[PDB]
Write a protein that binds this DNA or RNA. Structure first.
Lengths: 97, 84, 105, 93, 92, 103, 78, 94
DNA sequence: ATCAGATTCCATTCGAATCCATTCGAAAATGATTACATTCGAATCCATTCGAAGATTCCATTTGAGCCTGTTCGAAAATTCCATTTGAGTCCAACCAATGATTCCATTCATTTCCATTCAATGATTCCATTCGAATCCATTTGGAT
DNA sequence: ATCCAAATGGATTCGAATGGAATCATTGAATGGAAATGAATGGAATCATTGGTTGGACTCAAATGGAATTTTCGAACAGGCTCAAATGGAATCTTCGAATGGATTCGAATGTAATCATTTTCGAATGGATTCGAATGGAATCTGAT
């Protein structure tokens, strides 16, 4: 059996998903999660499918953006790996804290 | 309907992993997948809160994609393609 | 029976942009040339974005512009990217960028 | 259910630039979002513009200094141009 | 000619803190604060009236405006102080 | 005789009414909106002035100058969030010094 | 004139940000960023000044510009 | 006095102060130059140059706190230009 | 650690000077006030739309084995950067002397606002046309081990 | 440099969802004749600032000296990548009742609109102040060596 070496199906995957636009979170698990957040906000609420699609969209946008900024925080400290410390720096300079 | 508990775990290790790829990330630490589900949660709360407030000044009990839109706009993250 | 979209040489309806200026409560009265000048800036901005999009549309071998093309159009044009810094495209994607330090040794 | 969109005019302006290429209704949507966003940014900026100077009307000069204020660099130039000629051609009947 | 809030911020100050006064610079900051806030709230109210396409800003608009701008329990306390101001006004 | 008293407020309600019609917010202004709003403004000033007075003296100065205002806003989480994107003239910073740099 | 903003002024501004040690190439990067800032603000400022057909910048115009950039200023009337 | 703690003491010196940290109007020198590269025969109100200086040093203290955190993040106690560029990139200023 | 000498903050009083205080007239503003307009808050009957549930496929999810290499390690080398005096260099601020540049009127013409009253424009329909979302393939890798 | 192995392109064909026309009908631009403003328009005091020239004085610019932060190493440790077999549950479909919107009717209750007349609010000085910049003494503190 062959084993591709550590990290080189990772690169293959970056180029994999960057060349695609599909939604990366699976649609139904997300849709529940939205119904939970929404309900434990207010009850007997109904959604337009366009409204969770809108959400998930904005969400993966938000997250992938944050992931790029996180990765730069990784690189800046000379690391190849993103840690929570990075995400907390990214969202601190983004001004979310 | 069944009780809604613990759906933030439907956002799996791999889904978070892809979202790291398309953002251009190589190696993902173990402590990340919790920390991702954390921030995602905060995010979707602040937007969904703001969506629903629009819905109920609208005196509707169906959240419109326009309200998702306005909400997002209010946050400083403008979204295109659902404006109808 | 003259349409104003012809009288300034525009495709973008100037009469409409006038109505929408009044129906938006931007100020109590609207000059005659403001709807014109604006329908101009919008038609121009549409034009610029649309044929930058067409470029990547046909560089990916496709007869038709899907949001991806739009996204690549904006993200690669510095002034447009700046204009849309806070905008997020439906179904957009990202630019195939890989930080250098992540390539093999 | 019937009201507005710019899709007609984005479609024509599309045939002006790239007469070969077509447009998919989603990407058409994103353009509607763009015209709407921009209409709004400009008209707001112009409206606060009339307001800081205490005047009750929005003119071409207002839309203009709005365009100079929002748009970065050379499309700000190209825009002021495209508008200045749209207007001078207008007042000519 | 022309206007400022310095009168009412001064009253509200000594009503609250009859101990303390205010230096005209900090007074400015307060004027700016009132102006900023007025502006944010009224605008949000205006788009709110627009998104549902109605020609009047009511108490109800100012309200979901304030729920929208202000964070958490400063929003709750605010909805209060105003919601009472309005019925005690309207009781005549 | 002012509506501000009839609603029990120090902040001018009439002014806010005029400033709503002439600010181009919509062609019609409800009767209760200016009141409710003048209330939110009186309250928010009030809250600020009080937190400002408290932090005005633990240092024993007569009255509220900008720095006091700054410390008031930046120390109260809800105010700091609200005004995060505002910058106060003559404010200063909170005396924070990162730990990793201490002796 | 960008160096009329001296090294000491820059290092003090580094202090109030709570910094221990300053690099040699910093003061350069500082003058750079300050320049870009003062530029983007003053440009928008001036546009406000002469849509008014006034050729003296009012502090109100600097305020408006700053508002437009997303950096709001309190105490000069806005 | 030993390396580095006249730095700390000076941190407390200026944080406990609100003083304008850039001199007078060498700043306004710089302001007028930058301004006339935009338009000529321009005049300023003293309040307006003060306004500028104010928002400007505000801006700078912000960039320095964020950059300092970038310095810490990399295990370093000293701010480098690399830091300023990381901060200014995350803020979306690049 | 509790000597051990200096800077150095950290404060308790002083004789002042730059504001803020309340007063003290002169607009601009609010509040009424009848008299119109209008907006919608209030009933419906249609019509979209969504929530639901069951079922069957196989795409992913998971989970644990195994080990390469990336993180952190302590240490050792090299260098940039703090602390510190001295030169002098340009500021703080000081009024102060000048006419440009605001900005407020009391005129008019051109300009925008209304408001019916049609004229096309535009938008909703199917209506049957084409790029394309799947489907394999092998050319072309590209990989990591020989 | 070598043959080998899954993976990656990107060019062939296949029925199908998607886009782009032609067609009938509902809004909405648009004409065109009075009604109401709006901005310069030339004409004037007024404010608010360029402009030099003036001194004591920090505040700056350099340049010694070394001390610790940073760099770079080289080593130890462990965490995360990668792969593979089970299978869990998403994705797809197509059903179907009816809660929840929504177009459109409809009027009392609400906000405008001149039109006044009364007072609030501004601006501008005028009389106690309140804290700035020293004055030092005293912990408080930092850090050099029995």
């Amino acid at each position: 059996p062959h084993r591709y070496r550590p990290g080189t199906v990772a690169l293959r995957e970056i180029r994999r998903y960057q060349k695609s636009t599909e939604l990366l979170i699976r649609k139904l698990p997300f849709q529940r999660l939205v119904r939970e957040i929404a309900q434990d906000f207010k009850t007997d609420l109904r959604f337009q499918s366009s409204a969770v699609m809108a959400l998930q969209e904005a969400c993966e946008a938000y997250l992938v953006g944050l992931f790029e900024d996180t990765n730069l925080c990784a690189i800046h400290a000379k690391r190849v790996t993103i840690m929570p410390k990075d995400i907390q720096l990214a969202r601190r300079i983004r001004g979310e804290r | 309907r069944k009780v809604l508990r613990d759906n933030i775990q439907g956002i799996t290790k791999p889904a978070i992993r892809r979202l790291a790829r398309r953002g251009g990330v190589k190696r993902i630490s173990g402590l990340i997948y919790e920390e991702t589900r954390g921030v995602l949660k905060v995010f979707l709360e602040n937007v969904i809160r703001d969506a629903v407030t629009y819905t109920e000044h609208a005196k509707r009990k169906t959240v419109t994609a326009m309200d998702v839109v306005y909400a997002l706009k209010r946050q400083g993250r403008t979204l295109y393609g659902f404006g109808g | 029976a003259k349409t104003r979209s012809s009288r300034a040489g525009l495709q973008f309806p100037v009469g409409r942009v006038h109505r929408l200026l009044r129906k938006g409560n931007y100020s109590e009265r609207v000059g005659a040339g403001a709807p014109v000048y604006l329908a101009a800036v919008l038609e121009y901005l549409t034009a610029e974005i649309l044929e930058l999009a067409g470029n990547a549309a046909r560089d990916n071998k496709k007869t038709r512009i899907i949001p991806r093309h739009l996204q690549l159009a904006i993200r690669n044009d510095e002034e447009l990217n700046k204009l849309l810094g806070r905008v997020t495209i439906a179904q957009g994607g990202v630019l195939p960028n890989i930080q250098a330090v992540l390539l093999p040794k | 259910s019937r009201k507005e969109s710019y899709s007609i005019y984005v479609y024509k302006v599309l045939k002006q630039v790239h007469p070969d290429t077509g447009i998919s209704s989603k990407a058409m949507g994103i353009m509607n979002s763009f015209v709407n966003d921009i209409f709004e940014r400009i008209a707001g900026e112009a409206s606060r513009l009339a307001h800081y100077n205490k005047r009750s009307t929005i003119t071409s000069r207002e839309i203009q200094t709005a365009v100079r204020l929002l748009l970065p660099g050379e499309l700000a130039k190209h825009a002021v141009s495209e508008g200045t000629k749209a207007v001078t051609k207008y007042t000519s009947a």
